């Protein structure tokens, strides 16, 4: 159908939208701390900590698939990268204080993302 088609076309600029925000947030972890999955095999207790492990490698995956539907679905990942930090991670950390520094950035991004999803619809 047409309708199906026009609602294909609105993921896709979404996804397009999502891509250029992904960016702009991953450019706010210079040192790389969040780009990849933490490795079980170099913290094999990992899952018993974290239930729901996040990181922007596996974001990227997600958006190249059309599978964030909404920006609220893509900020709940995003928020999954910096919460899960904060919670392993002791405040007096390299890593705790990056997803601090993230979230802050992060923040004026995503403030603006949002005007623009209502914006364009």
């Not at 207790?45 to 995956?61: E, V």
């Given at each position: 159908?047409?309708?199906?088609?026009?609602?294909?076309?609105?993921?896709?600029?979404?996804?397009?939208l999502?891509?250029?925000?992904?960016?702009?947030?991953?450019?706010?972890?210079?040192?790389?701390?969040?780009?990849?999955?933490?490795s079980?095999?170099?913290?094999?207790?990992?899952?018993?900590?974290?239930?729901?492990?996040?990181?922007?490698?596996?974001?990227?995956?997600?958006?190249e698939?059309?599978?964030?539907?909404?920006?609220?679905?893509?900020?709940?990942?995003?928020?999954?990268?910096?919460?899960?930090?904060?919670?392993?991670?002791?405040?007096?950390?390299?890593?705790?204080?990056?997803?601090?520094?993230?979230?802050?950035?992060?923040?004026?991004?995503?403030?603006?993302?949002?005007?623009?999803?209502?914006?364009?619809?």
């Open positions: 159908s047409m309708e199906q088609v026009a609602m294909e076309l609105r993921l896709t600029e979404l996804t397009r999502l891509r250029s925000v992904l960016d702009q947030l991953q450019d706010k972890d210079p040192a790389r701390i969040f780009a990849q999955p933490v079980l095999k170099e913290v094999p207790d990992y899952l018993d900590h974290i239930k729901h492990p996040m990181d922007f490698a596996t974001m990227r995956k997600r958006l698939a059309q599978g964030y539907k909404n920006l609220h679905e893509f900020e709940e990942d995003f928020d999954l990268i910096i919460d899960n930090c904060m919670k392993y991670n002791a405040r007096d950390t390299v890593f705790y204080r990056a997803a601090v520094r993230l979230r802050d950035q992060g923040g004026v991004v995503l403030r603006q993302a949002r005007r623009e999803v209502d914006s364009i619809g």
